[PDB]
Design an enzyme around this catalytic site. Sequence first.
Site, PDB file in Angstrom:
ATOM      1  N   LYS A   1       4.981  57.021  36.286  1.00 37.42           N
ATOM      2  CA  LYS A   1       4.449  57.545  35.032  1.00 37.42           C
ATOM      3  C   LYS A   1       5.282  57.128  33.822  1.00 37.42           C
ATOM      4  O   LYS A   1       4.790  57.149  32.690  1.00 37.42           O
ATOM      5  CB  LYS A   1       4.352  59.072  35.082  1.00 37.42           C
ATOM      6  CG  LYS A   1       3.148  59.602  35.836  1.00 37.42           C
ATOM      7  CD  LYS A   1       2.938  61.095  35.590  1.00 37.42           C
ATOM      8  CE  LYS A   1       3.884  61.947  36.429  1.00 37.42           C
ATOM      9  NZ  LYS A   1       5.245  62.087  35.828  1.00 37.42           N
TER      10      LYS A   1
ATOM     11  N   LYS B   1      10.270  70.542  42.378  1.00 39.53           N
ATOM     12  CA  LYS B   1       8.813  70.607  42.457  1.00 39.53           C
ATOM     13  C   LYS B   1       8.151  69.827  41.324  1.00 39.53           C
ATOM     14  O   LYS B   1       8.652  69.807  40.201  1.00 39.53           O
ATOM     15  CB  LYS B   1       8.375  72.079  42.426  1.00 39.53           C
ATOM     16  CG  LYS B   1       6.892  72.329  42.202  1.00 39.53           C
ATOM     17  CD  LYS B   1       6.105  72.328  43.501  1.00 39.53           C
ATOM     18  CE  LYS B   1       4.672  72.790  43.262  1.00 39.53           C
ATOM     19  NZ  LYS B   1       3.854  72.783  44.503  1.00 39.53           N
TER      20      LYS B   1
ATOM     21  N   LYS C   1      11.221  68.700  35.080  1.00 40.23           N
ATOM     22  CA  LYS C   1      12.354  67.813  35.335  1.00 40.23           C
ATOM     23  C   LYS C   1      12.639  66.855  34.180  1.00 40.23           C
ATOM     24  O   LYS C   1      13.788  66.678  33.779  1.00 40.23           O
ATOM     25  CB  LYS C   1      12.136  67.011  36.617  1.00 40.23           C
ATOM     26  CG  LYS C   1      12.325  67.810  37.894  1.00 40.23           C
ATOM     27  CD  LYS C   1      12.011  66.951  39.109  1.00 40.23           C
ATOM     28  CE  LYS C   1      10.590  66.400  39.041  1.00 40.23           C
ATOM     29  NZ  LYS C   1       9.576  67.483  39.061  1.00 40.23           N
TER      30      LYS C   1
ATOM     31  N   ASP D   1       7.483  64.511  44.026  1.00 42.32           N
ATOM     32  CA  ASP D   1       7.173  64.229  45.426  1.00 42.32           C
ATOM     33  C   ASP D   1       8.045  63.113  46.001  1.00 42.32           C
ATOM     34  O   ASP D   1       7.720  61.930  45.879  1.00 42.32           O
ATOM     35  CB  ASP D   1       5.693  63.874  45.585  1.00 42.32           C
ATOM     36  CG  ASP D   1       4.778  64.993  45.133  1.00 42.32           C
ATOM     37  OD1 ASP D   1       5.140  66.172  45.336  1.00 42.32           O
ATOM     38  OD2 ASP D   1       3.700  64.699  44.573  1.00 42.32           O
TER      39      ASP D   1
END
Lengths: 417, 488, 268, 267
Positions: free
Chosen positions: D40, D9, D14, D127
């Site tokens: 990012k 998620k 992570k 995602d």
Amino acid sequence: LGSPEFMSGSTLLKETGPREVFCGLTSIVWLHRRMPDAFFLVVGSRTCAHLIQSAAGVMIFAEPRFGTAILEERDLAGLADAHEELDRVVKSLLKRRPEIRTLFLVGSCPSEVIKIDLSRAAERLSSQFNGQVRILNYSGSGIETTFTQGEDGALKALVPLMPSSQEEQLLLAGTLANPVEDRLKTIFNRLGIQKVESFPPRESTKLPAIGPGTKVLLAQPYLTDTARELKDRGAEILQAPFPLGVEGSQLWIEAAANAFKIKKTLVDATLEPLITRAHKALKPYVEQLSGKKLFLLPESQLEIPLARFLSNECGMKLIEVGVPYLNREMMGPELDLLPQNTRIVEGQHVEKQLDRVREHHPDLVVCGMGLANPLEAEGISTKWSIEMVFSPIHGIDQASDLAELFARPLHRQNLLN
Amino acid sequence: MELTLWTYEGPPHIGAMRIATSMKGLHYVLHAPQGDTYADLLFTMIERRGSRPPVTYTTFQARDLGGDTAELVKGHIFEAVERFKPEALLVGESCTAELIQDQPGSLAKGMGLNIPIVSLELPAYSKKENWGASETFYQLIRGLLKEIQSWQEEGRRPRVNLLGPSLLGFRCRDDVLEIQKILGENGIDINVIAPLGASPSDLMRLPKADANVCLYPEIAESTCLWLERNFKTPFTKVVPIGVKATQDFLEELYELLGMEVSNSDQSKLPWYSKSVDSNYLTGKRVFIFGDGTHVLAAARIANEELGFEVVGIGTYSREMARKVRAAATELGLEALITNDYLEVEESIKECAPELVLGTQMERHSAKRLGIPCAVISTPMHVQDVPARYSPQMGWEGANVIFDDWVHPLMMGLEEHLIGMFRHDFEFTDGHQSHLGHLIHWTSEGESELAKIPFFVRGKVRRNTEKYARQAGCREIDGETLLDAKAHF
Amino acid sequence: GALVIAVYGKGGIGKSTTSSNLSAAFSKLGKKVLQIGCDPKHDSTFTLTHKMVPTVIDILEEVDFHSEELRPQDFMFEGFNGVQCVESGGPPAGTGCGGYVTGQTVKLLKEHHLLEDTDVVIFDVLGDVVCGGFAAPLQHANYCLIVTANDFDSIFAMNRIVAAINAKAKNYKVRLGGVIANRSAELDQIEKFNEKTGLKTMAHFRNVDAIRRSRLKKCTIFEMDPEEEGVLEVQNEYLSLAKKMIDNVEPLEAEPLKDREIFDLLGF
Amino acid sequence: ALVIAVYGKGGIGKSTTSSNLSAAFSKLGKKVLQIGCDPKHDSTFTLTHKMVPTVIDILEEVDFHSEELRPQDFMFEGFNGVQCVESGGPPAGTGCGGYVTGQTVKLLKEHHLLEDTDVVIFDVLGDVVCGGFAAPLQHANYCLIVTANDFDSIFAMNRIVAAINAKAKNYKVRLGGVIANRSAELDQIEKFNEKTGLKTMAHFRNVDAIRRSRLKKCTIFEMDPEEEGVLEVQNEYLSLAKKMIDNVEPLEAEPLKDREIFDLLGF
Ligand code: PMR
Ligand SMILES: Nc1ncnc2c1ncn2[C@@H]1O[C@H](COP(=O)(O)OP(=O)(O)O)[C@@H](O)[C@H]1O
Ligand SMILES: Nc1ncnc2c1ncn2[C@@H]1O[C@H](COP(=O)(O)OP(=O)(O)O)[C@@H](O)[C@H]1O
Ligand code: SF4
Ligand code: SF4
Ligand SMILES: [K+]
Ligand SMILES: [Mg+2]
Ligand SMILES: [Mg+2]
């Protein structure tokens, strides 16, 4: 092939799998000649670029009429602003062709997948000029459009630019050959309908006005979105079969005459000599075509009206009528004219469809040019499907010419052997 | 973004398709959107083939993007192998599929198929057609042969591989025939012709040759290099297009094979070009463009065999750039290295040649500029895949080249007559009947400019303006045009 | 009117939780509201419906993707206090193209005039805006709200989004509406970033377990037991945020910072 | 080379987990390579105390001629010898991040960077909306999934499990287990674990020192030992690394249907 559906005595099947069709980008090939004052700039890859020139580049161009803004690595990496890039490209294009009056930014699979907002770019670019160049947008992507659906996109993009008027007007929507356009107008004028205009026009800057009191006849079966958009602006969309052959053209013309309340004795006195002469002209082709088994692969959405004409007026037997898309409400009048028990397949699995062709071994297979010559080598006669989009096939007077298009490859088969 | 009115090459997967289709027993699963099957027409219409390309396209639609496109390609790999039963399988992506990154190649290698699998990594946004074909050809052979002098001792005739020829290549059909014929007359057998006509099984025989003949470096140079490193097989580097080039090629191959001793008059070009009706060909100004190989070949022919003056030269093959620059330097020119059609058009316009020897795209600019044109290289269309024997290579290739490159030019008598008499009602300025078709300049200055007999008028106007700038000259007149002529 | 709001922010920051409860807040304030989930996971509106409703591509599949046959209310579903719910849906993980699916869904909803005839539209977008497709709601929104926490990675993500809003503002009416602090006890890092960028905090939610529990119970915070810890403050805050968007909201002039600048800015 | 892919998620932690895990492996004497697969590019900054240049920026420098690049051009040494790579990607709402990430993974494979080391950690975004972010899966031995004890993270985990199972049909990648993070308890997770076949490999509670470590641009191993929770968290990272070397086993797991997990989780 899934469970069948039944409409107007005919069978509607759907098939999924590998497809062999053109993407909507290919609309440029005919559209750039219908409207020579327009330029078609694709935003996509080298694949898209290669497509168009492999199609139209057999001809030699002193002046470019189309092109591709090819996405580069920096574009995909977002290291260059897409809107700045588009502006720069459109800038240097109008340098080479400063006489462009309307510029079409055509969406492709790459531009549509990553969702470059070409529509806003078109709006902003239109603003920066607005006295000289109109810049518009439509999608011709393979993932979204098949072949002639590209024209539907292009025409839909012109609709908001049509002047607003509540005048008497009969609008003929869909690409017509120049002499066919003139012929239909002449006939329509004989019925007392003085205002008849064509969409698209011959010049992009001279769009017909629209509004209530405008009756619209659809000459092409692939104008689903354009018709919807024309209706949103007040026009009445007349329902009728498509002007292919005597039967289709007669009813198509009658639809407009009925809407304009033209007296039936007048429309009969006008159409009678045309119909009688057409029946006379059709005879030698009917002799060639009657009893022949026909099989059409999906390509253009012309397949249903073509099948209707070839069976009803030329006496061909239909094995399978494939379409890449089926607007059932729009094909309504056409489905009623089709002979009972017609097998219509929406979608395609080309390998399985090929098996059906091979097992039947039709007298004439209407197919694309990716299958035409290979089928000929297997001893199966073909009629290349693209031709109907590039031929004058509409109207009572063009019935024999339409039949000749299908009689020709059979005739040649005989001459050569 | 890159504005592209005309692209000199297709995307790299076309090059991959060219390899698979030129070969036999090699299928190609291509992850691509609905519509990319237009590529089939390159082979069914332009190459006029009576068989479908051995390519299975996944043809995904927009609705598929909301689903499992990876499962979609897996199903098509199963179907293709089951239905077509090939010796080896190519798996790759198109430009659009490259975006969604389904890794179809590595997927194929995890599906338990018991045939060789070549996973193609072609960057559609960085590389092009010829790179695609060369990469595909290289990986297939590298994959097939990785795990793995004499002819004098065996008592057999020397045997060579012909590497390079392919469908959608330029006159590959007849170049192969011509070269094979010439080698046989020189006592040299053919081992394997690839990719054109070869199976994966044939490719296994590649080390069995005494030497590799690299007919089309754009397609087969990487492979010949790999074959040389791994199997010690030497390869020719002279491409035999042109009389002198064919002679050099023969001498080169003889060395690599170790033979002793190709005559010039085996082609008819030398006599035709030497004959007096070719006198007026001397110094005709020509622009040259196309892929590296054909540009380099054309350059020597125009300069050393026909007597033309090369006034412009370039290539779209960046991998061939240093060689085209070296050739341009000998010719006293700067080489135009670009894939930008507008740059090529501009360069032609600026040097105003009497003849353009380019690609299908140069016909566009030559038409606009009114310059006689001839096609010497891909990109091409159907006219350049003729029924008749039409090599560019070897003795007969030079014969074809002479006819075709001289044809667009106005003929001798007519050109002389138009320089003499300008007031005709039928034979007007710029008219070529053998084609069967009916800073400030003073008024004094332009009159002397109209005297100039057409196709050379372009250069005259340039040279006069350059002359007028080069001096303290203002305006231009009839005398300064004559001054410019004597100056150059 | 219609007030169109796009909710972006760091992944998992609580965009769906906030959006659902915010929609519920508007409805309690009398407004009629549509909420649209722009995420392949289709987990945006389930607390409004107590159910996972079929997605936009589900309805399209039933109609074999025929536009002319498409029915408007077929992909819309009524939820808490009359809130209308739509999920765009998308491909399974690791394949297809969720970007195209979301972007094309937005256009499909615009063309069918769904962004009209309602008071409040709220787009609830996923975390990683990896392509143009997921920035599609920004083409129609009046305001963008960015959810963030009081830590580095959340604020760093907010900054990247701020840059996206500014890029979109060059061609669309969308403006920054403010910052929603979530899962945080204090705001020291957030207000530091706000100070240099010109952004403002519009709402502050602490780390409340009742909020976590509410997602597990498939209900809004308004359906949780009021006597449960923190429930009252949270309910009031959602209502306050809704009231602010009706009564007080103003386009914020904001400039993002460079990566190296926000790096040196945040910390101790 | 043990190749590990980290999914889960969005914002579950992570990048926080991966970087600290890479540090833990290195403290065990292992050579580590961590790869950030996220536009990012915020995966490895705690290992290097700075933003390292991204692969896409390096490629752009050489006009995307990748053959001019060497590992030294896009790979940078961080905490205790750990090597770091950031794929980089487009600005938010532009380009195609999946394409970019896909290209990065391929470049790394070209230079054999997934072979010439002991442990490789792919740190992927939340995602997974396309194939590009599933690209590390062809090279991974195991996939770790990070989740919290709540509905949305476990639901997201369920989707990822379905994806891993799919790829495992044709790839060697296997589920290595679940990393419980930012949670005091595990009741919902083990409810999911028992019914799917997954098991929890490590548990990290909501520790402020961890939040602080991201802000201080360092690993948990560089935090003050007397600060609350630091030693505990360090030992849990060390344990997880120890597990991946000696205890890790391919798990047989089958994901739940949307309706099932919807009804399974809750009270
Ligand atoms: C009647 C015999 C005959 C033949 C077979 C040719 C062929 C020919 N004549 Mg000609 N020519 C013939 C006669 C004449 N020519 C004449 C003139 C002439 C010119 C200026 C030229 C020419 C040419 C030719 C040529 C070369 C092909 C061409 O370019 O026309 C042939 C085969 C051509 C050339 O290149 O000559 C070397 C050229 O510039 N001819 C004249 C002047 C009154 C006569 C009687
Ligand atoms: N204010 C809060 N306090 C405590 N937990 C929260 C809060 N906001 C969100 N959460 C937790 O975060 C999880 C993910 O929220 P979600 O709406 O899925 O975020 P996103 O939509 O950004 O992915 C939820 O399951 C919830 O338990
Ligand atoms: N065990 C934990 N305790 C407290 N905060 C945590 C913990 N794990 C992660 N976080 C917070 O969550 C934020 C998101 O971390 P990040 O690694 O960016 O997640 P992802 O990579 O999944 O998006 C971090 O800034 C950190 O402050
Ligand atoms: S728009 Fe799509 S189908 Fe058409 S040429 Fe481009 S990539 Fe191919
Ligand atoms: S990054 Fe976006 S546009 Fe690119 S493949 Fe993934 S979902 Fe599609
Ligand atoms: K280029
Ligand atoms: Mg969400
Ligand atoms: Mg991360």
